[PDB]
Scaffold this active site. Structure first.
Site, short mmCIF file in Angstrom:
data_model
loop_
_atom_site.label_atom_id
_atom_site.label_comp_id
_atom_site.label_asym_id
_atom_site.label_seq_id
_atom_site.Cartn_x
_atom_site.Cartn_y
_atom_site.Cartn_z
N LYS A 1 44.58 1.06 -18.53
CA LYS A 1 43.63 0.27 -19.34
C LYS A 1 42.66 -0.57 -18.49
O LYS A 1 41.46 -0.44 -18.66
CB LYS A 1 44.33 -0.60 -20.40
CG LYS A 1 45.08 0.25 -21.44
CD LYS A 1 45.63 -0.57 -22.62
CE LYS A 1 46.49 -1.78 -22.22
NZ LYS A 1 47.64 -1.43 -21.37
N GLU B 1 45.99 -11.91 -19.34
CA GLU B 1 45.83 -11.11 -18.12
C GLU B 1 46.62 -11.68 -16.92
O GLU B 1 47.01 -12.84 -16.93
CB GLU B 1 44.30 -11.14 -17.88
CG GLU B 1 43.73 -10.35 -16.68
CD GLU B 1 42.45 -11.00 -16.14
OE1 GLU B 1 42.45 -12.22 -15.86
OE2 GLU B 1 41.45 -10.27 -15.99
N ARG B 2 46.83 -10.89 -15.87
CA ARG B 2 47.47 -11.34 -14.62
C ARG B 2 46.45 -12.17 -13.84
O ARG B 2 45.34 -11.70 -13.61
CB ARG B 2 47.89 -10.13 -13.77
CG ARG B 2 48.91 -9.22 -14.45
CD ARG B 2 49.24 -7.98 -13.60
NE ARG B 2 50.10 -7.05 -14.36
CZ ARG B 2 49.66 -6.17 -15.24
NH1 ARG B 2 48.41 -5.91 -15.41
NH2 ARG B 2 50.45 -5.50 -16.02
N1 LIG Z 1 42.64 6.51 -12.45
C1 LIG Z 1 43.66 6.07 -11.72
N2 LIG Z 1 43.78 6.50 -10.44
C2 LIG Z 1 44.80 6.05 -9.70
N3 LIG Z 1 45.78 5.21 -10.05
C3 LIG Z 1 45.63 4.81 -11.32
C4 LIG Z 1 44.63 5.17 -12.19
N4 LIG Z 1 44.82 4.55 -13.42
C5 LIG Z 1 45.90 3.83 -13.27
N5 LIG Z 1 46.44 3.95 -12.01
C6 LIG Z 1 47.63 3.29 -11.49
O1 LIG Z 1 48.08 2.36 -12.46
C7 LIG Z 1 47.80 1.02 -12.01
C8 LIG Z 1 46.48 0.56 -12.57
O2 LIG Z 1 46.40 0.91 -13.97
P1 LIG Z 1 46.24 -0.28 -15.03
O3 LIG Z 1 44.83 -0.33 -15.51
O4 LIG Z 1 46.84 -1.52 -14.46
O5 LIG Z 1 47.18 0.24 -16.22
P2 LIG Z 1 47.56 -0.42 -17.62
O6 LIG Z 1 46.37 -1.48 -17.76
O7 LIG Z 1 47.43 0.60 -18.69
O8 LIG Z 1 48.84 -1.17 -17.45
C9 LIG Z 1 47.88 1.10 -10.48
O9 LIG Z 1 49.21 0.91 -10.03
C10 LIG Z 1 47.37 2.52 -10.19
O10 LIG Z 1 48.03 3.13 -9.11
MG LIG Z 2 46.16 -3.79 -17.18
#
Ligand SMILES: Nc1ncnc2c1ncn2[C@@H]1O[C@H](COP(=O)(O)OP(=O)(O)O)[C@@H](O)[C@H]1O
Ligand SMILES: [Mg+2]
Ligand SMILES: Nc1ncnc2c1ncn2[C@@H]1O[C@H](COP(=O)(O)OP(=O)(O)O)[C@@H](O)[C@H]1O
Ligand SMILES: Nc1ncnc2c1ncn2[C@@H]1O[C@H](COP(=O)(O)OP(=O)(O)O)[C@@H](O)[C@H]1O
Ligand SMILES: [Mg+2]
Lengths: 57, 456, 73, 456, 456
Positions: free
Chosen positions: D153, D179-180
């Site tokens: 996301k 958010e973090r």
């Molecule tokens: N397009 C992408 N390419 C590489 N890693 C990704 C990608 N999307 C997510 N990730 C992995 O997931 C994390 C970032 O996604 P994030 O946006 O934080 O997910 P969510 O918000 O759905 O929890 C990182 O640990 C990364 O390695």
């Molecule tokens: Mg996130």
């Protein structure tokens, strides 16, 4: 001999695929019982939580 | 001073005392006209206290006088308890007269401190192939036998009592918490006829008993064991079913005015277990090797009571209804059962590798189950067919006839050493027994008996 | 290493507070230009201790009898 | 007049005022001495109001005097908010001193009337193959990034911000809700180092803040976007997680005296969501284009919160944990994602046929997957064997390396125009690239690159 | 005396009476100046009673006077109720004027005592071959009716209504528990056109009525049936849907605030079913036999409603959509339908062997049909082809022209006796009719009519 064994291969396969279809149904029937138990259990838990919160508020 | 019963609801009673004479929590109270004992649980205010009856409440009424004893439930301890049967309050229930007690101890105590703890890694051979292989026990450690209704907990415990009393020379303490009265009678006469009774202390609070008895019997047994541990002795503490201590707490929780937690359990579930479980430990003064049976409600290992118990034990033996349905006894799940002693630095690499290898084989067989269920074993790869064959032999070689089960079956019991156990499974894994039929391994004790069973 | 213990026999309040006490001991190094590492061996046991206190204080329960603010914990 | 605190329980505070001076619903109150703001949520009766703290209560006491401000939370609005970081109360949370505001608006407001809504289908290009194909965004439309924990996301939103906000000529509001704090710092330094911080207003309410802060942060950011929309401008509004607004209401609902509903949610879930979501819209004065990230509890799209959110959005992009578990990113689900702009009368028949063609191939392969697991690949018909190959390739060709993900991927980021997105998928569906190995389409931007990767 | 409405919350109304005039549980109360009836559910104490409105509560206000009637809801009984449509209170919902009643009975009473039960099991001769052979009904028994719409449910009820009245001198009562107003009008005209309306009393509780009406309609219809039984008759009680009786009880239990049970049903589920079902029995004067349509929630037979109902069923009649396509209009499935009376210790060895012989032959034919389809008709043995010929003849001889179906079948109706039914099927199993064409055994009634339809 070769041709007759091919006819045997087809018949044997017919029975194996019948057995596999029947066995699949038994698994479907058993899983459906577990699904009904999981369905009924989920409803009771939610009602307890609703009643529990309403008995506090 | 003297209070008046002001309220009665099942096993729970409220008593009012003068504001300058209110009893403390856990203080014992006696009803004047019936001598029924009550234990104070909480102070409600206005001089009113709430208590649990240590007996039946039928025939009690509001307005009866109650006497405060000035102390918690105190039970007799020491050598005078050996070869005797007692109830929750420390009274004798064996018709053999009064107990020759020298002193009494209260049943509520604090756990031994962090600086009085002791580390036990000395292996305790049980004589059972599956336990000696994947669940090695240790002297001064805690064992739990987890299982549903009618799967093997009482039978698998009675065999370990027989095969651990072979090497142990000290005293034992047995606490019967909410189980069958006939099984307490059977065990008492068996030890009396075998002359083993003069080294065992027996405490009972079975299923026939009210909630207060079933809730405190565990503390009364442990208190006598602690006396022996603190005299520098090696003791064996057996608890017939530790789940009943928690369940007796659930029956009374709503009556104590507490809001319920998940699936109707008391909000205090993990603290009640820990306060009893922490005291069952080996201090530096002495050791308490303990074995406790743990009932699993409706076969659900994720239920809050069983789930909260795993963290309090050194060895976990998980019995299964499916293994029992195939005919195997004891019905231990090698993949779910585990021990803190299953470490290369404690048992050696050879035993650790044989166990790791047996588990690896069974795990892969479990994964192939669905494919075989619909298409059969014939569609598998050459290596997979070989593993499925060794996994099946290993499964039946984990079966063993017990000396407490010859009455049920008629076959004679077997004791297998740790050396013979390792040799049998190592041979089946290496393939040295690939020419014997699977049924030559079922109930054969040692591997040589499987070779002689294969001759028929 | 600093070892902070709140064993199974201790009050649910001490088990609920232990992660915050350990965090405060780790923060001493962070605030002074140093690096620290902290391990919470079981946050699921801290949540069970917090649920006990909250139910005994008669606060209304949530999703699995857990307090409404178990996320904020 | 003046009030006294009468009851503090967690984040909820009761304040008693003269019965002739009771503050209004949503009115802001200030505690004397302590720096704390309370918003009236309910008028219990007898001069008492129930309020939620916009700060900590560790320093609050019973009897502290509270002051009525005569209005709801008033935050600064307009040009002075650009290039600044602010809290829920509108205070600056950056070291750049005070903000030169020329007006303050109240965070609470009515939604635009039915006669004020405006309809537009201007197609907005994102540069991502999966989105540009199955989820075409539109200028002034509402987008939702649905997904569980750890599926992309934030990453996807950052890529959009980069491919749209940076080029966008108008202003922008970024709201970090629950958010973090680390993501907020990385994004601030990213907007500052990219020289784009001058056209972006930043409002932050992270997970370390009290429930009341996380419950009103979304109204603060939206109030700033509404001032710009009402000036006749085109605005971009990015919300990090709108679920935290619903959750803050669940955390406080029970202490506000409300009985719980299904899945332990506030009984006002659909109205509290509608009151916020109806203000995030494009009227006849200016256009707000908005992207919201929507957390899905336990990956279950049927949970009341995610389920109530779909009806408020124009474009719904769904991220799948099963695709992410195969090393595929972006993990958008083409068979679950949808868009209103996907209509031949809005885009064109060539685009629509390519999108439906991809969906048809992937939907049929979802059923052959299990067929291939049991039995084998050989037992399939030639058309099924040929289809399985294209489906596995299309799934891989949907993967695009992003510049914001270079830290994780290790490879350079790529940007694909919708033309290349349509061309490549059409060719694969035609079978032109059936001569390329499956591994060549993984993270290869345009189809051309895939032809080059096959040679390595 | 008279009381006053004190509280109104939906369909639940609280009424306050003088201390010497409090109405009894289940007593009917009348609001002055409005056509609204209240049934008393609980006595809260302090003069106040909790009741459920038997109608709409719109327009009511606090302080209206209420009058006690001295008894429970009392309905008209006897001959005057035949050919009439009534509500839960016994009012004539048809525009045909007042009911010519001579007596009124209260709807609440105890089930007939242990001494009032009949001295054995007596079959009810329905006159329908498939039912009298495979699904034998006991007098005073309960029959569960299963199947979808458009499969002959209504025609089967009308045929039973005609036969009990003309061939047994009995009567019928129909209880529309949660009746659809469109279907209730259609059923009334179908019975008038079929000339069966003067043999049945119609009691309807429509879906748009409050929960209290839908819960009490079954007792109103049962009270009319009890009167005819006392006259010296055998009576049929039809309940439109027994699941809706259970749901109306769940709705009322929730309105009264009671704590819900497993799967959300009322805590009184088994008692509410027992109070209704235990009045339907064979006494020493007459016998009420009941036909009840059954609905299964989520197709789960273990759900509390199906589980509780099945405990009181003596027979199960299943109507099949497949059989209807074949052309057998009765449409009862001979393999899925069952009866507890199908026991040689009840119906004698002759009836039992004949019925089990038909089921054995029909089972083998269903297996053989899959063989004929997959492999062909030539693959069968001579004995199997002869069995197929008898099975087809048996299958068509299970058909029968009903007096109410002459409009559809174009042929006169038939009433076959149990004696003629057993004799006809016994001959076909033995092969006495192997020379006749199968069509000669279609829509004929008794076995002599097949022999005559053949000569032609
Ligand atoms: N397009 C992408 N390419 C590489 N890693 C990704 C990608 N999307 C997510 N990730 C992995 O997931 C994390 C970032 O996604 P994030 O946006 O934080 O997910 P969510 O918000 O759905 O929890 C990182 O640990 C990364 O390695
Ligand atoms: Mg996130
Ligand atoms: N041969 C056997 N070996 C082991 N256990 C057996 C055997 N045959 C039957 N069992 C069953 O093992 C069970 C052991 O006690 P169990 O029922 O598990 O304990 P509990 O009473 O506490 O639930 C008994 O119910 C017993 O009938
Ligand atoms: N015994 C019968 N003989 C001839 N036709 C019948 C018979 N039973 C049912 N049918 C046909 O099936 C239709 C549906 O039957 P009906 O009793 O009305 O079922 P349902 O009430 O569920 O609609 C009838 O209208 C008629 O066409
Ligand atoms: Mg037992």
């Amino acid at each position: 001999a070769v041709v007759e064994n091919n006819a045997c291969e087809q018949a044997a396969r017919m029975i194996a695929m019948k057995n596999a279809t029947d066995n699949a149904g038994e698994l479907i029937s058993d899983l459906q019982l577990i699904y009904n138990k999981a369905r009924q259990a989920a409803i009771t838990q939610e009602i307890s939580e609703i009643v529990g919160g309403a008995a506090a508020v | 001073s003297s209070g008046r019963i002001v309220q009665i609801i099942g096993a729970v009673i409220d008593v009012e005392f003068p504001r300058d004479a209110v009893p403390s929590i856990y203080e014992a109270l006696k009803v004047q006209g019936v001598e029924t004992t009550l234990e104070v649980q909480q102070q409600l205010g206005d001089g009113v206290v709430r208590s649990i009856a240590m007996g039946s409440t039928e025939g009690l009424k509001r307005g009866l006088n109650v006497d405060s004893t000035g102390a918690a439930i105190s039970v007799p301890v020491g050598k005078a308890t050996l070869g005797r049967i007692m109830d929750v309050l420390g009274n004798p229930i064996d018709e053999a007269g009064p107990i020759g007690e020298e002193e009494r101890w209260g049943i509520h105590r604090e756990a031994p401190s962090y600086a009085d703890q002791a580390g036990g890694n000395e292996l305790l051979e049980t004589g059972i192939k599956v336990i000696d292989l994947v669940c090695p026990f240790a002297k001064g450690g805690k064992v739990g036998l987890f299982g549903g209704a009618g799967v093997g907990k009482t039978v698998n415990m009675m065999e370990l009592i027989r095969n651990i009393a072979i090497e142990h020379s000290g005293y034992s303490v047995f606490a019967g918490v909410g189980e069958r009265t006939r099984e307490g009678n059977d065990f008492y006469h068996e030890m009396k006829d075998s002359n083993v009774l003069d080294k065992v202390a027996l405490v009972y609070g079975q299923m026939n008993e009210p909630p207060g008895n079933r809730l405190r019997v565990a503390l009364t047994g442990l208190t006598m064991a602690e006396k022996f541990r603190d005299e520098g002795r090696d003791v064996l503490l057996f608890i017939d079913n530790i789940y009943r201590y928690t369940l007796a707490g659930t029956e009374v929780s709503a009556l104590l005015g507490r809001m319920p937690s998940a699936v109707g359990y008391q909000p205090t579930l993990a603290e009640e277990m820990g306060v009893l479980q922490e005291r069952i430990t080996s201090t530096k003064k002495g050791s308490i090797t303990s074995i406790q049976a743990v009932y699993v409600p409706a076969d659900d290992l994720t239920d809050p009571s069983p789930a909260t118990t795993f963290a309090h034990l050194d060895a976990t033996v998980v019995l299964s209804r499916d293994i029992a349905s195939l005919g195997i006894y004891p019905a231990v799940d090698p993949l779910d059962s585990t021990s803190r002693q299953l470490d290369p630095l404690v048992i050696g690499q050879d035993h650790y590798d044989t166990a790791r290898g047996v588990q690896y084989v069974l795990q892969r067989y479990k994964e192939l189950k669905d494919i075989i269920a619909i298409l059969g074993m014939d569609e598998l790869s050459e290596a997979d067919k070989l593993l499925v064959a060794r996994a099946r032999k290993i499964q039946r070689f984990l079966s063993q006839p017990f000396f407490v089960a010859e009455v049920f079956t008629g076959s004679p019991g077997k004791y297998v050493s740790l050396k013979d156990t390792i040799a049998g499974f190592k041979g089946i894994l290496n393939g040295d027994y690939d020419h014997l039929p699977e049924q030559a391994f079922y109930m054969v004790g040692g591997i040589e008996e499987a070779v002689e069973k294969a001759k028929k | 290493t600093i070892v902070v213990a709140a064993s199974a026999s201790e009050s649910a309040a001490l088990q609920y507070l232990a992660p915050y006490s350990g965090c405060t001991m780790g923060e001493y190094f962070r605030d002074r230009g140093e690096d620290a590492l902290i391990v919470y061996d079981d946050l699921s046991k801290q949540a069970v201790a917090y649920r006990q206190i909250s139910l005994l204080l008669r606060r209304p329960p949530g999703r699995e009898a857990y307090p409404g603010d178990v996320f904020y914990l």
